[PDB]
Structure 1
Amino acid sequence: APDSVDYRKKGYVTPVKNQGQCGSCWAFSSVGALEGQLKKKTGKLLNLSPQNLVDCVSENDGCGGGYMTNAFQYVQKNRGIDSEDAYPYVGQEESCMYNPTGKAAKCRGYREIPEGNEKALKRAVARVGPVSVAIDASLTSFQFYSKGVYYDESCNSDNLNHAVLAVGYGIQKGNKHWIIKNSWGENWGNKGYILMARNKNNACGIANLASFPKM
């Protein structure tokens, strides 16, 4: 077989989604990883509730931003995360209204990939499934990406400002990459996804704050 992987072909990744005017990328990145482990464990692909996270992970700041680890920790000690269906995404923080009745998954903690180590991230994506990663999506070059293996010498691995999901990795025009599921609607980039540079000195800090939930 090939030196690459794509969990979209295993039905691990739900349809692209759109944050709207809410800094909820962390929530979508978290839901993404959770959904992947859920499919892997129960064989059912399902959208988990990003709003549940936005309104209940108090260690984060709702539409102000957050970390995926805090999100996984929350799911763990809250002993559950509601499904999208049971806790719709309204794109604006409101009081926590988590309901045990709509629980569609749980977490048993999380593991973090060694900072800046793309080989470790590769192994993780291989062993586990979709992995949450943080990146530098400042550059306008990132803003209107549409195809190819994105790479911009101007990216700053120290400037992590967006949270997304790594659902695979491979090669293209002889370009090693990471298969990234963004959350700015299917309309953005190649159907919501974007291929980012791999083994290129940790371009855009793809491996500086990666993690996955245990389930």
Structure 2
Amino acid sequence: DLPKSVDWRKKGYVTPVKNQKQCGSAWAFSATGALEGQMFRKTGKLVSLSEQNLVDCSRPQGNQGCNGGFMARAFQYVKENGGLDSEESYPYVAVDEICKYRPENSVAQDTGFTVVAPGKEKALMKAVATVGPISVAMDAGHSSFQFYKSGIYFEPDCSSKNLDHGVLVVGYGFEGANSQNSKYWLVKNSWGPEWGSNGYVKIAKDKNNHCGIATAASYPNV
């Protein structure tokens, strides 16, 4: 059945780490990271997508730009809008601006999104293994996360229910030889390559949905 490990970065599904800077747009980076991987799966072409397009244009769907938002509202906006522009055509500036969506510059589409059963790490494992990178929310409100550097992240004060940060699960794995021991979720952050481990963090896997990684997972349908 399911592989002992997955890493979509090794198959060309993931763009290099990005930096949201001083703007609460992590939800937008998480949504573009999931759409980048589904579009790569569908066309074989990896194209960086515009977080700014989401920040400026998805207020009608319930997002609030640099004040926060949700990946599912972003996929709903891509669906209702009929498209989403490339990173190159609609560059990121980390401030709320006027919607400048240009259909001629669109390089992605989705028909809606699929939800992972909430709180179910095994359902999340199956989604990651068979679909590609998955958008997820997590409790990142801790100094231990801010200064994380390496190893399997584990924070006693983490919540599986009150989440404040959107990220992207690009795979899962384990340390050592036993595939069922010291497992982790491979997670792409949006605080620059300089943060954490080359912009990534290993989050403890199958330890009671630590930090809520499987509480609100979803992926776009392309």
TM range (shorter): over 0.9
Distance 1:201 1:140 in 2: 21
Matches within 5 A, 1:63-212: 63-173=66-176, 174-212=181-219
3-state secondary structure, aligned to 2:119 = coil
Alpha-carbon shift at residue 90 of structure 1 (Å) = 0.9
Distance 1:139 1:175 in 2: 22
**One-letter code of the match for 1:159?**
N
Q: Deviations over 1:118-166 (max 9, x none)?
A: 0000000011100000000111111111111111121111220000000
Q: How many residues align?
A: 215
TM-score by length of 2: 0.95
Alpha-carbon shift at residue 2 of structure 1 (Å) = 5.2
Distance 2:73 2:98 in 1: 18
3-state secondary structure, aligned to 1:35 = helix
Gaps of 5+ in 2: none
Distance 1:194 1:206 in 2: 12
The 8 Å contact of residues 149 and 172 in structure 1, kept in 2 or not, is answered as no
Give me the CA root mean square deviation. 1.0
Distance 1:191 1:172 in 2: 18
3-state secondary structure, aligned to 1:133 = strand
Gaps of 5+ in 1: none
1:6 alignment partner in structure 2: 7
2:22 alignment partner in structure 1: 21
Q: What stretches of structure 1 move > 3 A for 4+ residues in a row? A: none
Distance 1:130 1:169 in 2: 10
Distance 2:85 2:107 in 1: 5
Distance 1:106 1:7 in 2: 21
**One-letter code of the match for 1:177?**
Y
1:49 alignment partner in structure 2: 50
Q: Deviations over 1:13-57 (max 9, x none)?
A: 000000011000000000000000011111111100000000011
The 8 Å contact of residues 52 and 87 in structure 1, kept in 2 or not, is answered as yes
**One-letter code of the match for 2:40?**
K
Over the matched positions of the two proteins, sequence identity in percent amounts to 58
Q: Deviations over 1:167-213 (max 9, x none)?
A: 00010154111000000000000100000011100000111111000
3-state secondary structure, aligned to 1:186 = coil
TM-score by length of 1: 0.98
Distance 2:159 2:3 in 1: 30
